[PDB]
């Protein structure tokens, strides 16, 4: 029953509306990020969804004790009665604290004065994805830790562990992308109001090529089969020849309307559309040689044009 | 230790139901908007999305002091107990106030008595466009804001810096896909209501479409059809019914261009520019096809 | 600091959980609204969204104060410490008030005891199921409210002006149809807990035919002319006329589905599927005649 | 005036967390539901949205008063200062109280002590959807009213008014389904913890056949044409007759895409899909055997078996 | 009358923010669940749904009393005052604590000092499904939950009844439509964290895909197409254009059905068994066109 009087001594006389070590030096805040999972990437809304432990720690004079030897894990509702930093995320769109039983707020106190505050939060952060080249992607999806109402002479940030402040990157299993590297960058960013610390957790996303590369082969094999249908046959039964070239536009249409819901209406550069242009202009070239009718010469010229086409595609892929 | 007594001195009888200057002059509100990223524009819902740092500031004579420091960067829990203006967006649809470890509200008192109060908000608003230039139109999305319960004889809005230099895109705050942000234009304005006359700060964002694949993916399957129309009328040395079935594809391509356009724009009553732009391309087809069907 | 004294004198002995006129007065309340926008009638949920400025006015024998102040303006912070009458919307699916940036709650108190109050509300209300004539649309779209707790013997709603008290000044406000007029209606509905007055507000609309003009023209200017050139072509070749007729009904099928794709299915006919089915069965009868002519030419 | 000090003594000395007759007889609770609308019966998510005027009433000797012969409707800021029963719904997913001007929370008091409580609740309740027979299937989706933390020795539920406790059901209109009957069940459920009462409100939903017969009759003309063109064309250009029946296979594929967009994957096979796939296999095999080998036999075989398939389909459909 | 006078004696001196222990015995909580239902799996975004009752029980010596009856039932209002552990799910990405007229939380205080505290929940947890065999899926979906701030030296979770047999209860109501509940397997573990060491209660749900949902939906059209692949071998040697045109008309539907089978299928880099089934169908197509071009 000794601990209750000490906690009441710590609370009676405390002001939540002041930062610790007030009127003096800036206080440091150490962060730690435990990425649970990249929850949901969305190429429609130019964004992704992340679930992580955001842990942070600092030091104060207002909370110190000497009687209790061990550390003091305390209830989460004392966070409404203790000072915390106003750390936010810049590129977010919709975020929340998980409240499945309570607010997941880890409050741990030390006899020194080291105060620990932990959250399990899910953030839907935007990522400026450049969709110019589709097979290779190499994104840079940032995650901008930044204070809100404290200037750089009032606060400073640091990674608690350097590279060791970020834990759990290798345990991420994404069905659509793959991590190749992650980077933690500190940066001082000024505004009209003032200067602010800004940590950045960035990482690249190499797309898992197998799913879309098995979706890519089907129009190519389809149009090679269509070329071999329209090429080898004699044209006395010309209705057998022309009905092959009739139904090519619906085959192009199915793949185009399937991809049009996946990728948005970005006008700039679409590499899938460049590939489908190399396909459908080749469809028009096959029909052009048909209306020009040399059939065996066009049949031999079709595979070497397909080979130079997907060689151009492969060198566009490997850059 | 001393600052606790200081802040307790500033609440001995302080009220929040009264603006500073009742029975006195009106209140002066400096206002600044620092946008972060101009988001996506839902043309199907004629609304856009934008992330702002909404700064606003006002002098309050009830809070002067002679303390050791001049400006104290207080917490927003103090700002919940202070008077604030009732600013709101006149055309906002679903606006969110971002909440985190603390709510994204700031407060900086001054020994003069002047304040500073910014809110990291995300506001979406309807941008009522017209489709008279539906391929390559350009519009000015509005953003109107002002008081709700305080008349022009109660509060007065004014931009903080010069109005040419008071809405700032950060460096590259562009979540835009279809459009190109180029400029902006603010102004004041007094709107008479059934209650009174409220002052309104109005801001227009001028934006114009990228030409791009919105023209390419619509004109190149039309380019293949108009090339097939020239290929059909080239010669007649070969068989004639090889040409007639060539019309049939140009039927179904008219299907594919029909579905590809309607999924972006809302169902409007008035016809647009791109609809006639593809209607003339449709009219180029079946006239020559009926002509060849009559003569052959 | 005079108003600080006056308003704090208006706090003790005043319960914020009671209506003022518990006695013989039935607490009549005037009301109005200013329609800011009427959003899209999506018709999949058969609902429509609408933004209004909704305002109420009543009296009190417990808030009369002294002179030298005609009316005092209040923020959104005295609404919890003052009794407010209930108002709830009947056909509201999700009527969420706007709470952004110190929320929209305007309040005024005169010396007489008259209290003005207002809000800023968006509604997604049900309108009707009017699918008799699909081009000839005429929806009334009622909007109605009552007190959820207080009956007609304890609360009374009243307008400010007979049938034209609702201000509405806009031209482009997400209306894909044509708004033609509005009116009010005051009724009393017998419920189980009591009897409650209902203040119905209609919004007369009519669908502009220009939206369905593109949906009607381009199938009509394709299928009918394809059926015409199926007969106008030389019928000596079997893969010309029958093939054109059989690909025409292949094209004519999916446009009926896409024309009924954005809007949900109904039980009764809407006289639009009947409007396209006549031409569909006409091209089908052209197919029947073409198949009949084949039986007596290949002898 | 005089009423305020009577309300004050009802608020003074009251304990919220103690039920009436705590340690005595079980309290008696009468409930009432008023269906406002059946909003959307989502077959894919297997749920329905219900708007309801939920209503409770009970007895409390602590909340009576001597004089003032009238009923005291209060503000909704007394329900947080009074006891309410913890009545939840079992199979809900998204449920909330509407907050239009305030929380729609009616408190009505009485001079004897009968407390009336009322809410306006929208509930997205899930129900079992057996999709073996698709037309005229009584889905029998229910709503399960149940208390949470009071054993049957502490509470008593009943329908307030008998069978007339459920109103407004005849005033409901659906574009797809139709009310045929509703029923109230009052049972007891034993858990590991204890015994709890349960009310259950059922809804058997006769689906209106008009949308169903439209989406049935629109593809039936296609297989009718598939029979007729196969019976009607001479077999010199036999590929010109067979290729139309193979385009009916992709017509079936478009119908199957509409089916997959309209229905999920279910182990118990439906009643709509089976006759269309059965007549599909028959009209394909008829074209196959016609191209296998003939003009009169095509006129004789296909319409008779077609009408036979029609009448056996109708006889399965009428059940 | 009497119980209010003793609940104030229970609340007198009981700190609402401290667990029993702290230089004393390790706090033990007894954990029980009750699966109300098991919601549908969402294979596109690779998650599932569950809604359960979640029970907890522990002893607090600072809550014993001497009353007339044995156990004492309370509301959720008093339950917000007694210290409860921070039990969170490791796999839940979006969860709701349901409330309707009250928070769905009861508090049963025994006279011995123990108490029961349960809540009705709903968890949208996910499973890392491997997709090497989509009709032959066999998955063990985890439902890990532990403490959030209290160390293994602070609290330890323990199942109430028989762990491997009767600590988890399926209540025979499942709204599933693609899978079926084979069984369950609880587990205990210790996860070494960057903060400290924490107990972990694991529960796996063994699931296999039903056979009549999509398996027949793929099995019927592929058999239809391989039947249509045989007629070209049935064709005459004097009927050479029909054997050519049969193959393209076969693949027109094969491509659309492959698109439809990959439509509801989520994205995976690993190959699926039905991807090899459509490959066998395409190989039959390739053999048919080889036998066609042999004549040609
Ligand atoms: C099941 O559990 C959930 C989770 O707790 C409950 O949801 C919460 O319910 C409470 C009680 O109703 C809400 O608290 C109240 O919130 C008022 C405004 O808060 C707004 O917060 C944010 C913006 O800051 C919005 O997003 C919220 O909107 C959400 O909720 C609405 C409700 O319908 C939804 O429709 C939306 O879609 C959002 O989901 C809220 O609008 C707040 O003003 C109020 O506080 C006043 O009253 C209390 C008690 O008197 C005191 O704290 C205090 O007096 C406050 O009064 C001050 O301010 C007023 C302003 O007018 C002044 O007049 C006063 O003088 C004084 O200065 C209260 O805190 C909470 O917002 C809500 N949370 C969410 C996420 O929904 C469910 O209700 C619950 N279900 C049950 C019980 O059935
Ligand atoms: C944005 O995030 C902030 C994070 O701090 C959040 O502020 C917190 O809100 C909660 C309520 O939502 C506050 O909790 C209250 O604290 C007071 C203090 O005395 C209590 O009296 C209140 O008790 C009420 O609710 C209890 C719930 O069990 C019941 O006992 C009873 O019904 C009481 O009426 C209540 O617990 C908390 O203090 C703040 N923290 C601050 C301001 O630092 C804010 O709500 C978030 N805004 C959103 C989500 O819009
Ligand atoms: C995503 O893009 C950002 C910027 O476009 C990249 O940030 C940049 O990272 C490099 C490497 O750390 C920084 O270079 C060096 O930074 C240190 C620390 O500040 C500095 O001392 C050196 O002089 C040098 O500048 C660079 O400054 C930084 N730029 C910015 C604007 O922050 C980031 O690395 C990219 N992430 C991925 C995964 O590609
Ligand atoms: C289909 O709907 C019916 C009602 O529309 C429901 O079945 C009901 O189930 C309850 C319990 O599950 C039973 O009610 C019993 O009634 C008897 C006689 O009144 C009573 O003595 C029992 O104590 C019990 O209350 C009964 O099986 C049945 N009741 C009725 C009136 O049909 C349920 O919603 C659905 N049932 C099925 C089998 O799908
Ligand atoms: C209280 O918490 C502190 C902070 O982590 C602990 O101090 C560290 O404990 C780790 C345990 O592996 C050691 O490796 C570090 O060397 C310690 N650092 C310092 C500066 O002491 C401390 O051990 C905890 N005490 C208790 C009783 O749990
Ligand atoms: C207050 O409410 C009670 C409860 O309904 C009313 O008592 C009943 O009222 C109905 C219709 O008014 C009639 O059945 C009887 O007058 C009452 N029946 C019983 C069994 O009490 C009461 O009338 C209401 N008070 C007033 C003033 O109307």
Author numbering:
A (entry chain B), D (entry chain E): 10 to 302, 320 to 345
B (entry chain C), E (entry chain A): 12 to 307
C (entry chain D): 25 to 323
How does the study describe this entry?
GABAA receptors are chloride permeable, γ-amino butyric acid (GABA)-gated ion channels that are responsible for the majority of fast inhibitory neurotransmission in the mammalian nervous system. GABAA receptors belong to the pentameric ligand-gated ion channel (pLGIC) superfamily. The large number of subunits gives rise to many possible pentameric assemblies; nevertheless, the most prevalent subunit combination in the vertebrate brain is the tri-heteromeric receptor composed of two α, two β and one γ subunit, with the arrangement of subunits being β-α-β-γ-α, in a clockwise order when viewed from the extracellular space. Here we present methods for the expression and isolation of tri-heteromeric GABAA receptors and the cryo-EM structure of the rat α1β1γ2SEM GABAA receptor in the presence of GABA.
The α1β1γ2SEM receptor hews to the classic architecture of Cys-loop receptors, first established by cryo-EM studies of the nicotinic receptor, with a clockwise subunit arrangement of α1-β1*-γ2S-α1*-β1 when viewed from the extracellular side of the membrane. Three dimensional reconstruction, combined with judicious masking of either the Fab constant domains or, alternatively, the receptor transmembrane domain (TMD), allowed for reconstructions at ~3.8 and ~3.1 Å resolution, respectively, based on Fourier shell correlation (FSC) analysis. By contrast, the density for the TMD is not as well defined. While the M1, M2 and M3 helices of all subunits show strong density, with density for some residues with large side chains, the M4 helices of the two α1 subunits and the γ2S subunit have weak density and thus we have not attempted to include them in the structure. Nevertheless, the density of the M1, M2 and M3 helices is well defined, allowing us to reliably position the helices. We note that in this receptor composed of α, β and γ subunits there is a breakdown in 5-fold symmetry observed in the homomeric or di-heteromeric Cys-loop receptors. While the distances between the center of mass (COM) of two adjacent subunits are similar, where the COMs were calculated using the M1, M2 and M3 helices of each subunit, varying from 17.6 Å to 19 Å, the angles in the pentagon range from 94° to 124°. Looking at the top-down views of five central M2 helices, the two α M2 helices are located away from the other three TM helices. The asymmetry in the TMD complicates defining whether the structure represents an open or closed state, as the M2 helices lining the pore in the β subunit display a similar orientation as in the desensitized state of the human β3 GABAA receptor, yet the α subunits are farther from the pseudo 5-fold axis, enlarging the pore. Because of the asymmetric structure of the TMD and the fact that the structure was solved using a receptor embedded in a detergent micelle, the TMD structure may represent a non-native conformation.
